Design a protein around this ligand. Structure first.
Ligand SMILES: *[C@@H]1O[C@H](CO)[C@@H](O[C@@H]2O[C@H](CO)[C@@H](O[C@@H]3O[C@H](CO[C@H]4O[C@H](CO)[C@@H](O)[C@H](O[C@H]5O[C@H](CO)[C@@H](O)[C@H](O)[C@@H]5O[C@H]5O[C@H](CO)[C@@H](O)[C@H](O)[C@@H]5O)[C@@H]4O)[C@@H](O)[C@H](O[C@H]4O[C@H](CO)[C@@H](O)[C@H](O)[C@@H]4O[C@H]4O[C@H](CO)[C@@H](O)[C@H](O)[C@@H]4O)[C@@H]3O)[C@H](O)[C@H]2NC(C)=O)[C@H](O)[C@H]1NC(C)=O
Ligand SMILES: N#Cc1cc(-c2cc(OC3CC3)ccc2F)c(OCc2n[nH]c3ncccc23)cc1Cl
Ligand SMILES: [Ca+2]
Ligand SMILES: [Ca+2]
Ligand code: NA
Ligand code: NA
Ligand SMILES: [Zn+2]
Length: 805
């Protein structure tokens, strides 16, 4: 109940929220149905429109007008944004040549450059180039400031998940807003775009920038604008707030536009109808910049022009219907559209089975336009599993398609021609970033980066300490002129052991055999040196990874590779080797096919055994350093050491063998050598973080050998591919993956074909950042390069996406 009989007189767009039942004049009052009786009259004035004209210049102040052209308006902070242009002979900001902002040029009393975030809904990345002729203001920001060719949103590529990631630096799974629609089974409550429940504070995790600001003494404007407040009024309210006294004036502001998303859904991303919304957004940008120029703030404020996601062509006829797959279709609830989320209609039904639903959705039609997943099997790059609001069964929908339960759902709801929500590596979902101002660089292009990184930067721009988040602080230092955060490398927690020869062959009883009883002082000393680390400069190019948790491990050296071997997990944490452009692939000779060899540096008690693999009818084994790439027949024997073996389902061995036999060599050819780091990952609770020992749910039968959920590889070379990977003088180039260690290849619908038709496609889907691997392993890579640490941080956040341009 709102007692709506108080008044907004002098309180219009007040910053502090007053408490019920007393009536509100802040810009959320509309959304809560709680504005005072006179809010429209006083706070939403529209008389005479939004622009001065010649005949209004110098007018008598009339408090009814939407904005003012009277002589006192500058001092009142409430001129129309074009007042100086029309009435004082000034130019529009867009018509001024751009000039480097080397230092902030701020009015007296400004403690720090303010930040304005100008967010645009559905602003696809390619609009910057394709719409540039109708967006002159935006094009000046872009060309004069700092810009990326695009910015990667988070999954799902929906509004609230992306805007709240922008505000928190958190993945949706951690902030809680995992879709535009949600059920929380602990609350027994639903979240919708429509209506009231979405404003309850329990939905919203982490700490958004406005709270971070407030808690550290920095004042914030509103971030949420009610749909009924027009854009011109939003801008005027910001400019009014900027004219407040020093002690009252906020330092951080946001504008939001519902366009171009709104029109994009109706007309498609490049509909001829889309030109007008782009023109209109540019006009709003021009209003803000002119307004800032009038206030002498145009060379003082940092402006971020940022989108939440893109837009793709999607029509009603490109809909897959779950009723064409499942008999039981009425026993499920589907969250539909550009992604699918499935749960039981009733938790009173004990005959609901995810296994059989998944199986009925798997590779059932030859051109099937969605793929089902248990959420823990989704590509780890999506980070979309560790929340009770994310249903166990997920459907990744191909770009340009929808999924629905039944046909009736689509026609009893063709309207639309655009939608978004797809996989966040899809080109059509990419969005924009431009930074303009004293703290950003001048005429600088930066590589594409992920929107999870911006919270840290916005905190740096305002002198704030960021709350704990998923950005990698320092990875965006190259965007900034000053206010860099100077990160330092984490300290290594566990130092390795360096074991020598300590065990006789007969001390082992592993059940392994190898045909290797075959015998010189020249080459005896030589092989001794390889086991002491003589080739380690070649195979370990960037120093050894640091172990950032407490554990017990050994560095093992060999001719062709180096490893960090875990006495606790009984396998390497990592294995490092370099394959030159000239290296040769050979086969595993006939006599060595089932060869596994005791490692005399490592005790029986900390070794795997072959008997376990013999008795486990589901599990086989593979090798981290590939025997196919041995540098010589004699060196090949090292690859069969029990300390290089890892457990592998036969189905996964198909993937792994093709990677090691064919793809590594291909990459060495194409990239002029590669350095490879491979290893296991254990993430049984799908939190994206390294499991401790006591979290492992599966072992090789009868043994203490834990089964990885995933295998990783990091593949590094010289960005200047005219230099070989092992003699690179400059910046690096990386691609990585985290492959799920699965007992079937059901994910790949063409897996009965030759590995050349499906394995590389799988690996591309499971592309990863080095940083994703760091979280999953507790390892810190690239510790000894000749590059700056900031540059290395940027490298660690790189994602090789395999999209074209
Ligand atoms: C991305 O960045 C984020 C941010 O850094 C990373 O997330 C952090 O990860 C930490 C480790 O997983 C986690 O630390 C835990 O904190 C617990 C305290 O939690 C509350 O307080 C924090 C801080 O203010 C708050 O942010 C949390 O908010 C969550 O929950 C509410 C709803 O309840 C949501 O509003 C919000 O969206 C958020 O949800 C997300 O996180 C939770 C986990 O907290 C998930 O469950 C959700 O699905 C969702 O993803 C919390 O309100 C603390 O209690 C934990 O301590 C246990 O473990 C330690 C280990 O040292 C041990 O000493 C203790 O014994 C303790 O165990 C006891 O509880 C166990 C479980 O109940 C029990 O089994 C034991 O036997 C014991 O009784 C733990 O320290 C931190 O909270 C989150 N932060 C956030 C914001 O999510 C994330 O990892 C990054 N991702 C990647 C891939 O790198
Ligand atoms: N950084 C950031 C940032 C965050 C938000 C935002 C606001 C929120 O306010 C809480 C609900 C009361 C919640 C979550 C958000 F992420 C944002 O919102 C713009 C917006 N205004 N009006 C809309 N209507 C439909 C959808 C979004 C918005 C804009 C930016 Cl630049
Ligand atoms: Ca949106
Ligand atoms: Ca884990
Ligand atoms: Na076996
Ligand atoms: Na298959
Ligand atoms: Zn939309």
């Amino acid at each position: 109940w709102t007692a709506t009989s108080g008044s907004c007189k002098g309180r219009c767009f007040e910053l502090q929220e007053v408490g019920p039942p007393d009536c509100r004049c802040d810009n959320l009052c509309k959304s809560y149905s709680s504005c005072c009786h006179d809010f429209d009259e006083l706070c939403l004035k529209t008389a005479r429109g939004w622009e001065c004209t010649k005949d209004r210049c110098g007018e008598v102040r009339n408090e009814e007008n939407a904005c003012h052209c009277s002589e006192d308006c500058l001092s009142r902070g409430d001129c129309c944004t074009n007042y100086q242009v029309v009435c004082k002979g000034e130019s529009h900001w867009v018509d001024d040549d751009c000039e480097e902002i080397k230092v902030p040029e701020c009015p007296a009393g400004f403690v720090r450059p303010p930040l304005i975030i100008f967010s645009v809904d559905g602003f696809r990345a390619s609009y910057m180039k394709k719409g540039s002729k109708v967006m002159p203001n935006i094009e000046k920001l872009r060309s004069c400031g700092t810009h990326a060719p695009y910015m990667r949103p988070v999954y799902p590529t929906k509004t609230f998940p992306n805007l709240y990631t922008l505000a928190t630096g958190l993945y949706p799974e951690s902030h809680g807003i995992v879709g535009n629609s949600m059920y929380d089974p602990v609350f027994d409550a639903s979240f919708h775009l429509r209506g009231r429940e979405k404003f309850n504070h329990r939905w919203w995790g982490g700490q958004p920038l406005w709270i971070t600001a407030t808690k550290q003494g920095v004042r914030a404007g509103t971030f949420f604008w009610s749909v009924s407040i027009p854009h011109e009024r939003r801008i005027l309210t910001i400019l009014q707030w900027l004219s407040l006294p020093d002690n009252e004036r906020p330092s951080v502001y946001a504008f939001y536009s519902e366009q171009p998303d709104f029109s994009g859904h109706k007309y498609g991303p490049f509909g001829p109808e889309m030109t007008n919304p782009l023109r209109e957004i540019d006009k709003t940008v021009g209003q803000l910049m002119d307004g800032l120029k009038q206030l002498r703030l145009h060379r003082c404020v940092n402006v971020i022009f940022v989108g939440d996601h893109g837009m793709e062509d999607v029509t009603c006829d490109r809909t897959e219907f779950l009723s064409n797959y499942l008999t039981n279709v009425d026993d499920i609830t589907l969250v539909p559209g550009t992604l699918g989320r499935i749960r039981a209609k009733s938790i009173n039904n004990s005959k609901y089975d995810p296994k059989t639903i998944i199986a009925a959705l798997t590779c059932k039609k030859p051109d099937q336009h969605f793929k089902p997943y248990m959420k823990q099997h989704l590509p780890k790059r999506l980070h979309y599993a560790n929340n009770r609001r994310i249903e166990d069964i997920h459907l990744l929908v191909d770009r340009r398609w929808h999924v629905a339960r039944k046909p009736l759902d689509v026609y009893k709801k063709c309207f639309f021609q655009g939608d978004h929500g797809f996989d966040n590596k899809v080109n059509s979902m990419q969005t924009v970033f431009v930074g303009y101002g004293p703290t950003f660089k001048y005429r600088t292009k930066v590589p594409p980066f992920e929107n999870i990184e911006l919270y840290n930067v916005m905190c740096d721009l305002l002198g704030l300490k960021p709350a704990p988040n998923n950005g990698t602080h320092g990875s965006l230092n190259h965007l900034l002129r000053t206010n860099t955060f100077r990160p330092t490398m984490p300290d290594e927690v566990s130092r390795p052991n360096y074991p020598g020869i300590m065990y006789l062959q007969s001390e082992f009883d592993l059940g392994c055999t190898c045909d290797d009883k075959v015998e010189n002082k020249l080459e005896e000393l030589n092989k001794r040196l390889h086991t002491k680390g003589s080739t380690k400069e070649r195979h370990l190019l960037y120093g050894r990874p640091a172990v950032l948790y407490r554990t017990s491990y050994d560095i093992l050296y060999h001719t062709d590779f180096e490893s960090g071997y875990s006495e606790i997990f009984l396998m390497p944490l990592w294995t490092s080797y370099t394959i030159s452009k000239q290296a040769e692939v050979s086969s595993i000779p006939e006599h060595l096919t089932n060869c596994v060899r005791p490692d005399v540096r490592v005790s029986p008690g900390f070794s795997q055994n072959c008997l376990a693999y013999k008795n486990d009818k589901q599990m086989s084994y593979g090798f981290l350093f590939p025997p196919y790439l041995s540098s010589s027949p004699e060196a090949k024997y090292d690859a069969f050491l029990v300390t290089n073996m890892v457990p592998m389902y036969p189905a996964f061995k198909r993937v792994w063998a093709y990677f090691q036999r064919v793809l590594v060599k291909k990459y060495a050819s194409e990239r002029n050598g590669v350095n490879v780091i491979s290893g296991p990952i254990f993430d049984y609770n799908y939190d994206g973080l390294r499991d401790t020992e006591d979290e492992i749910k599966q072992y090789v039968e009868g043994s203490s050998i834990p089964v990885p959920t995933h295998y990783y590889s990091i593949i590094t070379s010289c960005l200047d591919f005219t230099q070989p990977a092992d003699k690179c003088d400059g910046p690096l180039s990386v691609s990585s993956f985290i492959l799920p260690h699965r007992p079937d290849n059901d994910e790949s619908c063409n897996s009965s074909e030759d590995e050349s038709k499906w394995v590389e496609e799988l690996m591309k889907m499971h592309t990863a950042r080095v940083r994703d691997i760091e979280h999953l392993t507790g390892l810190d890579f690239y510790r000894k390069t000749s590059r700056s640490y900031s540059e290395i941080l940027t490298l660690k956040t790189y994602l090789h996406t395999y999209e074209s341009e």
